[PDB]
Design a protein around this nucleic acid. Structure first.
Ligand SMILES: [K+]
Ligand SMILES: [Mg+2]
Ligand SMILES: [Mg+2]
Ligand SMILES: [Mg+2]
Ligand SMILES: [Mg+2]
Ligand SMILES: [Mg+2]
Ligand SMILES: [Mg+2]
Ligand SMILES: [Mg+2]
Ligand SMILES: [Mg+2]
Ligand SMILES: [Mg+2]
Ligand SMILES: [Mg+2]
Ligand SMILES: [Mg+2]
Ligand SMILES: [Mg+2]
Ligand SMILES: [Mg+2]
Ligand SMILES: [Mg+2]
Ligand SMILES: [Mg+2]
Ligand SMILES: [Mg+2]
Ligand SMILES: [Mg+2]
Ligand SMILES: [Mg+2]
Ligand SMILES: [Mg+2]
Ligand SMILES: [Mg+2]
Ligand SMILES: [Mg+2]
Ligand SMILES: [Mg+2]
Ligand SMILES: [Mg+2]
Ligand SMILES: [Mg+2]
Ligand SMILES: [Mg+2]
Ligand SMILES: [Mg+2]
Ligand SMILES: [Mg+2]
Ligand SMILES: [Mg+2]
Ligand SMILES: [Mg+2]
Ligand SMILES: [Mg+2]
Ligand SMILES: [Mg+2]
Ligand SMILES: [Mg+2]
Ligand SMILES: [Mg+2]
Ligand SMILES: [Mg+2]
Ligand SMILES: [Mg+2]
Ligand SMILES: [Mg+2]
Ligand SMILES: [Mg+2]
Ligand SMILES: [Mg+2]
Ligand SMILES: [Mg+2]
Lengths: 185, 58, 172, 183, 159
RNA sequence: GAAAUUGUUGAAAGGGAAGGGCAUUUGAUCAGA
RNA sequence: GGAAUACUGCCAGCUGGGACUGAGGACUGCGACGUAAGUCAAGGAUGCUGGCAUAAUGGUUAUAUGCCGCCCGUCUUGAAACACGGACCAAGGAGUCUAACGUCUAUGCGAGUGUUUGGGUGUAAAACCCAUACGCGUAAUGAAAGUGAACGUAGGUUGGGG
RNA sequence: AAAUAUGUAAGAAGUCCUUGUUACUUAAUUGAACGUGGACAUUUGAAUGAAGAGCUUUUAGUGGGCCAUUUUUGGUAAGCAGAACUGGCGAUGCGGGAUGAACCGAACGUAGAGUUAAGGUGCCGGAAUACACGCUCAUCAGACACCACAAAAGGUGUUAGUUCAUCUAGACAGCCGGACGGUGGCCAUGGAAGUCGGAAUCCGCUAAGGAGUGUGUAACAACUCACCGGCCGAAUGAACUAGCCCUGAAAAUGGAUGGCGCUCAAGCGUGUUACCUAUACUCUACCGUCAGGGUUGAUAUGAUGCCCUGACGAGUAGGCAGG
RNA sequence: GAGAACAGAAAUCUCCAGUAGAACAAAAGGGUAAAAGCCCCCUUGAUUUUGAUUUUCAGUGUGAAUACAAACCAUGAAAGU
RNA sequence: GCAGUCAAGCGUUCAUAGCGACAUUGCUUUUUGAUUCUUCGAUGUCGGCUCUUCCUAUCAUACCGAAGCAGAAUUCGGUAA
RNA sequence: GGUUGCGGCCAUAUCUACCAGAAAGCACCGUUUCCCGUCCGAUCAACUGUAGUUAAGCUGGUAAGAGCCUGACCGAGUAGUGUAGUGGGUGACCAUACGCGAAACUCAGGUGCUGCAAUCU
């Protein structure tokens, strides 16, 4: 007998492979597994981990986000790496010339980058260009912006978006939502 | 039929399974209950300090 | 609690700025080892003086060997013990060659006759009665007569084997 | 030490030897029905299994732990021979924690060499003399997994104090015999 | 039926420290509390306003707010299996400055002084406190201190 | 043309149930090199 | 006065008998001995020999012997229960589908998305193709009339992977 | 006014120095708060540990509990009823307590070896009819906690003690001799003389004798004892204390230290060793799980692969995974 | 307690002692002495706005309470309340 | 319900022949309670009749000890179901 | 060092009974037109500092003084208590082991200390 100080046979709780069955994603994972093992590159390790992430953990990164990251001081010539989808944004009117490595590009995002005069490369092209992740800039989309997230932690005085199908007057706004009907929240 | 009324038996074991958690101290704690006069003036003091620190980059 | 050795145990009532060099109290403790000797020392010092193990220290512990381990002595032993219903003082006499053997006999005898365990007995005093005719217990006095002889009737020899072929004898 | 004792006796004084700086503690109680505070103290002394042993540097803060766990452990003052035999036969180190046997001095140097400990005898020295890096050397030592004693416990019942004819508590110098029979 | 009022079971807790009843001395009001100061809560039963609940008697917290006659104190209350932040509005008669950190501040100052004098004089720091160490060897003399032999005393009643 | 249930033959065991687990004796039977 | 011996402890002192185990499978390491070559008990068994070559070992099966073994299912704090169901066997026999949803995951596309109401077409309930709409999303808030998201490098501070 | 329990602190979000903002505050650049700039990494300021820490979502079952020690309420009490802390059972097998949910020991992958726990070692039954000092004889002996009951009160049974006494100037017991006088002491009584009662407890002779220890009479008488002597000659008496044993001690089918049986025990108290054996501990092998790693440089087809290292494995309800 | 016509044990007047042995609406507990008690004077903060907080607690509601803010007031010489 | 221990008293005298207050220790489970553990997919729920066996806290019978046992009768108690 | 004003801690400062107090201060003390308040110039208000006094207040001292305070190997490592045992005991309870550890009692000592400002033989 052993007085265990922790749960026995506990799984790490982190993905060690993508749940996806995409053969090309698995090939990318094989490449970056090799790189992360035999380069000592923190970039390679974090990209390998990012290649496992589920869809909601890979929120899209827009060309606007890329442009702001490049407006960062000294980042103007760094290659932007997005392990996920790069989406287009018409709210910007001056996109810079840059190199973006991403899992996927929207038609509009690819068009905007190429029209600005840059290149859209895949992550294996990125691995060939910078096996240690030289001069890279890893961008991540706004995870805590999902519609599902605003319902998380619902409760009194939390301000957290009740789960509701129909919105408007007569829909969860009377008793418990104002001091004139019983109480407020 | 009468039944048990109350006991704290097993409650500490239940609470310690996931452990009693210290409440994650933060720097810059909230100013929720702080005196509103102090807060009203603190907003102006901070806006002025921000303006001064901005202008101080010449 | 086992075969006994006698230890002198000297403790201090640890010095402070007020009282340097405290008064070095000593006891003769019959115990089977030194851990028990020091434990008994602290037990009796806490019965006697305002001190405890945490506020004192053991200055020394030394086994005391019998000065004449091969001469038969008569010991007077004064004990204090707790019965099931009270505390009592007792005086007994034990014939043996050493204080440790006398004390072991005393513990056996207290257990046998009064069901007094080790924890219930205090050895107040053990002293050799130097002069016979100061032996005051007949069960010892009968062994001090001149030219003492006695047979050992009905000798029972133990067989090494299950069966015997002779219908044995108890002569001696 | 021997000469100081003799000289004090010759001068009519008493040489009060220094208090012991090192104890070896062995958990002699199973893992069932332990009150929470003693159980936590046992886990913090890494005695999470019966017949597991660790070295503890004696201070007030650790003496008050031994006091709490007394009915579940036998402990005492380990000799150089006992420590040497423990480390030689049952010495294991924590390297990615990986319970690595101390079969070569290269492992000891690779993990404790930053403290000046280059060999198994350097480790034994840092244990017996409670050195500046005793905490790191002792924690690097995996808790010793001893067997039951080979000639028995010497008592019919283990779970009263050593003073009361049992096995637990401080048995100060007899811990060497117990551990030698357990090793 | 059962009774759990605000001041239930406080009969002795909120009493006035026999022969210390009456008016609160002026030092209590002359004390100065700043946001961040560590205070111990001990309710004064003679000041019924701004009084803490009985749970906070003997609790130590951090001043987060300062008002005319009171301070806001942050306490960490254990509820269930975690701690919740509680904000009490206590009048200054129910709080005192905590000495739970005066020893720490004095150690901080002595440590700075020792570090300075060390990096000025040589190389040694030894700035961490240490638990009470095992005693060192000593020689105990018998000159004027010959050991006295005690024996257990016989039983008697003396009643 | 299953099982329950049954006859016959063959084998075996059987002092107030039978059945089962570990191990081996004995009998019968059998694969592997 | 000089020894001895007991007791306790130490030896990186020597040495005899017994039991279980032999995992691994080129080399690589740390050592030891040796002057060096090499050798070794040093990162896990090899060497020599005998009988058998099949029911001999072994498997299966029945039986015997030693020790052990209450009747399952169920409700229950508690069942072998003098609690309930069950004489036996075969076959059947109990979380399904749907409308609308929460979380999570996969996929496609992405500020958009959904071809399949319908139309075209067809090798004809398939597959293929498609306009306008519509649904959800891209704006919230207020009972409502209504109003409606950049001081700033879409802010400052602290931490923050890279 | 404890013990136990309990709040806080033991640093870089720290300490020190200078000076910017403000509509707050001050008589006042006074202060408050927030900053700018500057200095301080070996012990960044106790110990020990840390199969890491932090965070989130979403759902199952459950929402009859019960037991043990300790604290504790109601009740005579209960295997009763109700609370506190912990540990358990439920949900759990295994060794022990014969038997048993909860007690003791210890928690469980499949095996081998060794050692043990609690409990045991006459035989059942593995293991000393071991060793040592005593106690006990029961015509209802006793024989291991939980636990399967016994008390007050007693016993020249026996053992060990405590205290006070007597004693060669002769003790205790035994046998024998004396056991008087004032005096029918005072009072009463119908009668009361030592002896139905109250009170007084004297004196002489004295070696010694009570204004009386009992029997006796109506009262007498008469016997008898305290008290003193004769004989004997070394020890003896009293009150207590507590061990074992005995009395106290009565129920219903025939039966239970588990059984047999056991008496310088195979009982009781105590001490020392040896020995027996759990699914526990130690070492090794194998299975699986988890974790950390190595290896896409080729013939190389299982990179979800191959391989190295360490640790772990109980389970109802329930969840998930691989089949 | 000591005193004063009726007037005594109880009327009213006076002094002394008096740590609260009184009073504070009510149950009990706490609290209070130049007061929180008694008497007197002035008053309506028992008002307005909408937040925060504590107890019960799911950290929901309700009740009750605490400390502020922004007003208008009361009282006092004033600090204040 | 049954039985002890002590012994102020009753018993003309006399605590204990036979009793026995004030107290106090127990036993039993043929009383009645207390509890709700078993049984509500059901243990046939009064009494009598019949019949067997068991217990002893013995009414009689056997043999005894004690007495406030002269005899007779009776009472107390022992071994005894 | 005394004294006053304001104080801090709130008896080592309080209470009882006596004695002493130089200077200054404080105080009692003198008066009722004014402001003010009373049944009452007793209190409170005002005026004088002049008529007087240390009688009292006040301060200090004294007391095998009461109280209070401090300390103690004084009691006491006692009571209690955390942890432990297949310890004892029919039980009630108790002993032992590892720790913590009172209160009463006894004795000894003490009887305000001090901040700011002003003033004084
Ligand atoms: K029924
Ligand atoms: Mg319930
Ligand atoms: Mg052996
Ligand atoms: Mg044992
Ligand atoms: Mg108090
Ligand atoms: Mg057919
Ligand atoms: Mg058939
Ligand atoms: Mg030897
Ligand atoms: Mg075979
Ligand atoms: Mg069986
Ligand atoms: Mg039931
Ligand atoms: Mg069942
Ligand atoms: Mg039954
Ligand atoms: Mg049913
Ligand atoms: Mg049926
Ligand atoms: Mg079927
Ligand atoms: Mg239910
Ligand atoms: Mg259940
Ligand atoms: Mg269990
Ligand atoms: Mg039993
Ligand atoms: Mg045998
Ligand atoms: Mg008795
Ligand atoms: Mg007569
Ligand atoms: Mg008996
Ligand atoms: Mg036996
Ligand atoms: Mg024995
Ligand atoms: Mg095994
Ligand atoms: Mg892996
Ligand atoms: Mg499992
Ligand atoms: Mg007033
Ligand atoms: Mg209410
Ligand atoms: Mg119940
Ligand atoms: Mg029926
Ligand atoms: Mg029937
Ligand atoms: Mg009878
Ligand atoms: Mg006047
Ligand atoms: Mg005046
Ligand atoms: Mg005067
Ligand atoms: Mg006095
Ligand atoms: Mg236990």
């Amino acid at each position: 007998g052993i007085d265990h100080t922790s749960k026995q046979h506990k799984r790490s709780g982190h993905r060690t492979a993508p749940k996806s069955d995409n053969v090309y994603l698995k090939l990318l994972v094989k490449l970056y597994t090799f790189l992360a093992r035999r380069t000592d590159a923190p970039f390679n390790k974090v990209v390998l981990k990012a290649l496992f992430l589920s869809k909601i953990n890979r929120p899209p990164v827009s060309v606007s986000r890329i442009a702001r990251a490049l407006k960062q001081e000294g980042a103007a010539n760094k290659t932007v790496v997005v392990v996920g989808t790069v989406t287009d944004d018409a709210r910007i009117f001056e996109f810079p010339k840059t190199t973006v490595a991403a899992l996927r590009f929207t038609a509009g995002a690819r068009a905007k980058i190429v029209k600005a005069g840059g290149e859209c490369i895949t992550l294996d092209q990125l691995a060939v260009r910078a096996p240690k992740g030289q001069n890279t800039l890893i961008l991540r989309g706004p995870r805590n912006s999902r519609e599902a997230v605003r319902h998380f932690g619902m409760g009194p005085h939390k301000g957290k978006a009740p789960r509701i199908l129909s919105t408007g007057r007569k829909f969860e706004r009377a008793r418990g939502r104002r001091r004139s009907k019983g109480f407020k929240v | 039929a009468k039944s048990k009324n109350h006991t704290a038996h097993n409650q500490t074991r239940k609470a310690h399974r996931n452990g009693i958690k210290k409440p994650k101290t933060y720097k810059y704690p909230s100013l929720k209950g702080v005196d509103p006069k102090f807060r009203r003036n603190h907003k102006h003091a901070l806006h002025g300090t921000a303006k001064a620190l901005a202008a101080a980059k010449k | 609690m086992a075969h006994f050795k006698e230890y002198q145990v000297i403790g201090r009532r640890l010095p402070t700025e007020s009282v340097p060099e405290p008064k070095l109290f000593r006891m003769r403790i019959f115990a089977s080892n030194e851990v028990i000797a020091k434990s008994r020392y602290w037990y009796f010092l806490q019965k006697l003086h305002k001190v405890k193990k945490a506020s004192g220290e053991i200055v020394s512990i030394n086994q005391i060997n019998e000065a004449h381990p091969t001469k038969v002595k008569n010991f007077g032993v004064w004990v204090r013990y707790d019965s099931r219903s009270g505390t009592h003082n007792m005086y007994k006499e034990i014939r043996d060659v050493s204080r440790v053997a006398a004390v072991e006999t005393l513990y056996q005898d207290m257990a046998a006759r009064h069901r007094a365990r080790f924890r219930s007995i205090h050895i107040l005093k053990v002293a050799e009665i130097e002069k016979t005719a100061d032996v005051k217990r007949q069960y010892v006095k009968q062994f001090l007569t001149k030219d003492l002889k006695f047979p050992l009737p009905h000798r029972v020899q133990k067989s090494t084997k299950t069966f015997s072929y002779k219908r044995p004898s108890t002569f001696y | 030490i021997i000469q100081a004792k003799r000289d004090a006796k010759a001068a009519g004084s008493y040489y009060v030897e220094a208090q012991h700086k090192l104890v070896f503690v062995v958990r002699i109680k199973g893992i069932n029905k332990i009150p929470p505070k003693p159980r936590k103290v046992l886990q913090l002394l890494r005695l999470t299994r019966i017949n597991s042993g660790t070295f503890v540097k004696v201070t007030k803060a650790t003496l008050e732990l031994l006091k709490l766990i007394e009915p579940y452990v036998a402990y005492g003052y380990p000799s150089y021979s006992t420590i040497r035999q423990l480390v030689y036969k049952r010495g294991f180190g924590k390297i990615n924690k990986q319970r690595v046997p101390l079969s070569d001095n290269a492992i000891i140097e690779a993990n404790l060499g930053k403290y000046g400990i280059l060999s198994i005898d350097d480790l034994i020295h840092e244990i017996i003399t409670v050195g500046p890096h005793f905490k790191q050397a002792n924690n690097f030592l995996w808790p010793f997994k001893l067997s039951n004693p080979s000639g028995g416990w010497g008592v019919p019942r283990k779970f009263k104090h050593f003073i009361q004819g049992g096995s637990f508590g401080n048995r100060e110098e007899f811990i060497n015999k117990l551990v030698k029979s357990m090793n | 039926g059962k009774s759990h009022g605000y001041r239930s079971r406080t009969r002795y807790m909120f009493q006035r420290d026999f022969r210390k009843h009456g008016a609160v001395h002026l030092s209590t009001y002359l004390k100065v509390y700043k946001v961040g100061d560590i205070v111990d809560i001990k309710a004064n039963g003679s000041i019924q306003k701004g009084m803490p609940h009985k749970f906070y008697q003997g609790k130590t917290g951090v001043v987060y707010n300062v008002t005319k006659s009171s301070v806001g104190v942050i306490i960490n209350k254990m509820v269930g299996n975690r701690y919740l932040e509680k904000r009490l509005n206590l009048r200054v008669e129910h709080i005192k400055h905590s000495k739970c950190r005066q020893e720490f501040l004095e150690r901080v100052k002595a440590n700075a002084a020792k570090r300075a004098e060390a990096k000025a004089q040589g190389v040694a720091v030894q700035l961490k406190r240490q638990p009470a160490q095992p005693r060192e060897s000593r020689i105990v003399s018998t000159e004027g201190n010959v050991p006295q032999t005690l024996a257990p005393v016989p039983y008697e009643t003396f009643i």
